[PDB]
A paper describes a structure:
At the heart of the spliceosome is pre-mRNA processing factor 8 (Prp8), a large (approximately 270 kDa) and highly conserved protein. Prp8 helps generate mature mRNA by coordinating critical rearrangements at the catalytic core of the spliceosome. The intein-containing precursor undergoes protein splicing, a process that excises the intein and ligates the flanking sequences, called exteins, to form the functional protein. The intein is also found at a highly conserved site at the center of Prp8 and thus is at the core of the spliceosome.
To further understand the mode of zinc binding, we turned to crystal soaking in zinc acetate. We determined the crystal structure of the Cne Prp8 intein in complex with Zn2+ at 1.85 Å resolution. Compared with the native form, the complex does not show significant conformational changes, as is reflected by a small overall RMSD (0.17 Å) between the 2 structures. There are 6 molecules per asymmetric unit cell. All 6 molecules bind 1 Zn2+ at their C terminus with the terminal asparagine (N171), and 3 molecules bind an additional Zn2+ at their N terminal C1. The Zn2+ at the C terminus is coordinated by the main chain carboxyl oxygen of the N171 and 2 water molecules. Binding at this site induces an alternative conformation for the main chain peptide carboxyl group to provide a ligand for Zn2+. This alternative conformation is not seen in the native structure. Zn2+ binding to either of these 2 catalytic residues prevents Prp8 protein splicing.
Numbering used by the authors: 1 to 73, 90 to 120, 133 to 171
The structure:
Amino acid sequence: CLQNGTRLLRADGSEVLVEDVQEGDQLLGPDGTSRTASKIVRGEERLYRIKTHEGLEDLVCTHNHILSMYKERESHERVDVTVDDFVRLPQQEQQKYKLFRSTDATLLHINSIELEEEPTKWSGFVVDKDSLYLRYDYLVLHN
Ligand SMILES: [Zn+2]
């Protein structure tokens, strides 16, 4: 699940805050096709903040959120990993995993991932098809 205030793309390209996503809403998939959101859930807890080397917005999500990543050795493979599992990996293994944006480099390098000191509100849902959808800046997100 994602911190409230995360900016996503509706299927028509307009922006929607993650907490404004309603049952049945249509979001944008990484291939440009539609995705349907369902099972809206909300909570409040200490989230993990992920900052990249590149100048894009931090990603703030729950400990059980699934990151969709490319892991080194074409040269990379697609891997899904929860924040918990990723946080516990040695940093030398952490190299190899990169976040990614939908191809119109598109790989993003994580500089830090840290548990935040105070709880904040989050919103989550499930998405059909490949469970992937787009942040407003085309960062590829998983359910
Ligand atoms: Zn979610």
